[PDB]
């Protein structure tokens, strides 16, 4: 084999996809629940997304509504949740894994936004 790259749990398409959505979920509701590879890569769908969207302007707000198709939680990312993370670099919205739930055995935390 080779080095550790991304992780296509399924195929190619099913693998930009998925990232979007369940990405705008951590801005609409400070609580999300996926699996193991869960939002570990969604921690990326958000920041990138924050920053380059930090300071309000034209060459930033657009990049926002490009990955996340939504007007509700695209403006709230501004005027809220920033300026709200001003003097803070990184640590945007991490999370500690949680024990697996019923049904499909798969441990899942709860993204959350600190």
């Amino acid at each position: 084999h080779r080095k550790s790259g991304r992780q296509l749990n399924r195929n190619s398409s099913h693998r930009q996809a998925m990232f979007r959505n369940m990405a705008g979920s951590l801005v609409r509701h400070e609580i999300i629940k996926t699996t193991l590879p869960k939002a570990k890569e969604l921690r990326r769908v958000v920041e990138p997304l924050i920053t380059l969207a930090k300071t309000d302007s034209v060459a930033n707000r657009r990049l926002a509504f490009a990955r996340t198709r939504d007007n509700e939680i695209v403006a709230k990312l501004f005027n809220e949740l920033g300026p709200r993370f001003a003097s803070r670099a990184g640590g945007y919205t991490r999370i500690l894994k949680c024990g697996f739930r019923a049904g499909d055995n798969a441990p899942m935390a709860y993204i959350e936004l600190v």
Partner: peptide, 29 residues
């Protein structure tokens, strides 16, 4: 009312206000 590591409040559904658990390990107070 049996807790894994510690002892006290428990529930066969959600974590507990002491350290949080089920089988995982994370969750802090």
């Amino acid at each position: 009312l049996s807790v894994d590591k510690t002892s006290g409040e428990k529930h066969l559904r959600h974590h507990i206000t002491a350290d949080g658990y089920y089988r995982g390990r994370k969750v802090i107070a």
